[PDB]
Scaffold this active site. Sequence first.
Site, PDB file in Angstrom:
ATOM      1  N   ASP A 285       0.860  -1.166   0.000  1.00 27.01           N
ATOM      2  CA  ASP A 285       0.000   0.000   0.000  1.00 27.01           C
ATOM      3  C   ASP A 285       0.915   1.241   0.000  1.00 27.01           C
ATOM      4  OD1 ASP A 285      -2.282   1.731   0.180  1.00 27.01           O
ATOM      5  OD2 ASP A 285      -3.314   0.297   1.518  1.00 27.01           O
ATOM      6  N   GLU A 491     -11.051   6.001   4.228  1.00 25.17           N
ATOM      7  CA  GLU A 491      -9.959   5.553   5.106  1.00 25.17           C
ATOM      8  C   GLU A 491     -10.086   6.208   6.484  1.00 25.17           C
ATOM      9  OE1 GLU A 491      -6.077   5.023   2.954  1.00 25.17           O
ATOM     10  OE2 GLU A 491      -7.354   5.346   1.165  1.00 25.17           O
TER      11      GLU A 491
END
Length: 602
Positions: A285, A491
Amino acid sequence: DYVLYKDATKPVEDRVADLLGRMTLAEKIGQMTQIERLVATPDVLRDNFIGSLLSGGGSVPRKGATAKEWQDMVDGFQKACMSTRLGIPMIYGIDAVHGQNNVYGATIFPHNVGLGATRDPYLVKRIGEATALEVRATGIQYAFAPCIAVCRDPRWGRCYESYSEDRRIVQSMTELIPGLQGDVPKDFTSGMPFVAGKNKVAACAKHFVGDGGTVDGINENNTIINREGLMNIHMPAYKNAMDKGVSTVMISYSSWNGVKMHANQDLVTGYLKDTLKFKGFVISDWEGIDRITTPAGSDYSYSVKASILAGLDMIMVPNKYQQFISILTGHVNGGVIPMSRIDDAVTRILRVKFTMGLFENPYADPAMAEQLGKQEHRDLAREAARKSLVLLKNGKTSTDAPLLPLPKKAPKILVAGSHADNLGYQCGGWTIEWQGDTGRTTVGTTILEAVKAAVDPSTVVVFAENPDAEFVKSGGFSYAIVAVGEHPYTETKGDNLNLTIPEPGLSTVQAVCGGVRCATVLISGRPVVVQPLLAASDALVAAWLPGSEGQGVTDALFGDFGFTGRLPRTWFKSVDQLPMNVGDAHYDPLFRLGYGLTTNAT
Ligand SMILES: *[C@@H]1O[C@H](CO)[C@@H](O[C@@H]2O[C@H](CO)[C@@H](O[C@@H]3O[C@H](CO[C@H]4O[C@H](CO)[C@@H](O)[C@H](O)[C@@H]4O[C@@H]4O[C@H](CO)[C@@H](O)[C@H](O)[C@H]4NC(C)=O)[C@@H](O)[C@H](O)[C@@H]3O[C@@H]3OC[C@@H](O)[C@H](O)[C@H]3O)[C@H](O)[C@H]2NC(C)=O)[C@H](O[C@@H]2O[C@@H](C)[C@@H](O)[C@@H](O)[C@@H]2O)[C@H]1NC(C)=O
Ligand SMILES: *[C@@H]1O[C@H](CO)[C@@H](O[C@@H]2O[C@H](CO)[C@@H](O[C@@H]3O[C@H](CO)[C@@H](O)[C@H](O)[C@@H]3O[C@@H]3OC[C@@H](O)[C@H](O)[C@H]3O)[C@H](O)[C@H]2NC(C)=O)[C@H](O[C@@H]2O[C@@H](C)[C@@H](O)[C@@H](O)[C@@H]2O)[C@H]1NC(C)=O
Ligand SMILES: *[C@@H]1O[C@H](CO)[C@@H](O[C@@H]2O[C@H](CO)[C@@H](O[C@@H]3O[C@H](CO)[C@@H](O)[C@H](O)[C@@H]3O)[C@H](O)[C@H]2NC(C)=O)[C@H](O)[C@H]1NC(C)=O
Ligand SMILES: OC[C@@H]1[C@@H](O)[C@H](O)[C@@H](O)c2nc(-c3ccccc3)cn21
């Protein structure tokens, strides 16, 4: 000499080995490096032999850029990569997670939680198919999807990116994968990567593993669960992904029992590669390796060692590529990271590139540009939005007339609420911007616009964003449709311990429903505190984050189709119950997983 890797008629494995054997260390490490378009330049791509680029959320060539503008951008980067000694084409990735959502005019599909409510894997496959076409319309070859997290606590900001708290539903929705990539052959070996060709994209099962199991739904935090539970809840959908030939897997920011996923050799190498026999490439990521340490980035030398030794193949840097390349080169020069590990990473990256046809079709197809926002795809999104709706209430007492479906012909109707005429709100996060945005951010149809498009020409439609009680009581309305809910988030910005909708929302519903019979449309990424909204409303619909096609909502409200969606998550009585999932010893939901009222088409 004849150069085997350039021969399109040769087997992938032969082409991979032939190319690998010709590469310098700089060329190998370059393949392992993914950079943001924001830091890319022709010289940078050429000089560092860069293997991949991405657009992060909102990383676009300009606002409102056309499909052709995206193609020209991607092709410009590709031309630089093709100009290297070996001419290895780069792969360009993007978060196309509910359509090609960064792109202006792209069809925006419902987010995953709503898709889970449909219980329709073939619908999701078709969404994958449409999404691949719209991604290829922009010249991009690689989508960072699906998120196969199993969200076990809706306080998580990414709960909307999870199809369900029930792994069985998440497993069923892995059909997105052969939608995006194409169906795998009869002969297919589980764990091999697959992409059918130039009209499909590489997919990415993410985020490995247990991203949906973090303490209190804290994003990027610690998932505290024994191996049995990890394997029974969080892992199963990865095996389905292997079976369907997912090309790539992205590692989670989260930890498992205190060990960072980005540093976990046991899970990444021991399990994903060695047990599931995954043969595509593993990607980090964004700054995921930086975040192994506390503070993040405080020991990047360690970050590089830990992650590459753990088994990661491609690093989403995404900005400081010079530091990344220099550090990794030094570790290899010093013998701290063996050439075998580098060779494995590159083998996997090249395997995906050759398999998907990237060496044969490194450039965009201008004839694909028209796929962007295509009406047929919008019709599909409209179908999905309608199927995702869960009817929670349809009358205040067991003896009231059902409110829904509403009549299309009435003298005067009211449409109200902060979410009634706000395209950005109905799309939620990962739309145009990373965090999503407010207002008319793209091409679409709001709930208000959909109502106006649906009703008889004799029906007067009044819009009031936040009318007071008197306005409604005095208005001469037949009924009202009131839309309220969460604002867009993504997120960590979505992490929320209270799960109460912003105001004005409840106040608007109370004002409207107090004056006329009302259908409340709740726009959210997850269950939220809902008893007060319920108490006020004649009917209430959980619409999730339905995307650009607001007519999906009105298709059900006015009875063109019946409601069929069922909750893909538990609806809690209060946040102090959390976490609380189906199958728990202590299970006291407001609405159980699978709950949903129905109507029939008029
Ligand atoms: C329950 O928990 C929730 C999560 O913790 C919490 O929501 C968060 O509240 C905080 C403030 O306490 C917000 O941070 C600030 O955001 C300000 C701007 O906020 C607007 O714009 C953003 C997008 O940029 C939206 O996401 C927000 O919802 C908000 O939207 C606006 O809301 C109005 C009222 O409904 C609308 O009229 C208006 O139209 C609408 N505008 C838009 C663009 O949609 C910033 O200016 C601040 O600087 C601050 O930002 C933070 O700064 C500190 C840093 O650490 C943070 O990273 C940074 O975000 C936060 O945005 C919000 N999170 C959401 C909604 O996702 C609930 O608080 C309630 O809602 C908030 C918005 C306030 O109204 C609070 O008073 C209210 O309590 C929590 N609820 C309860 C009951 O406690
Ligand atoms: C009035 O509405 C009701 C409630 O929606 C209709 O009954 C439902 O009809 C559905 C579609 O035919 C049934 O779904 C199917 O269920 C079977 C058995 O489990 C399953 O094998 C199918 O795959 C399908 O399940 C759906 O698959 C797609 C998923 O996205 C979705 O989540 C699944 O539900 C459903 O079971 C049935 N519900 C009930 C309680 O009966 C009703 O439709 C009429 O009756 C049904 C049984 C069927 O014969 C229809 O042809 C018939 O129209 C509807 N009435 C009318 C007149 O439209
Ligand atoms: C799960 O989330 C918790 C809560 O965010 C994380 O703990 C937090 O860790 C950060 C650093 O990573 C701490 O910040 C530090 O605070 C001290 C205050 O004395 C300060 O000296 C430092 O400059 C820094 O800002 C923070 O205190 C801490 N929060 C709490 C309440 O414990 C935790 O690390 C996360 N776990 C995982 C595995 O991600
Ligand atoms: O957009 C690329 C990836 C995406 O695919 C992952 O699903 C997601 O976890 C993610 N977070 C960030 C990101 C996080 C913080 C700041 C800037 C960017 C970047 N990304």
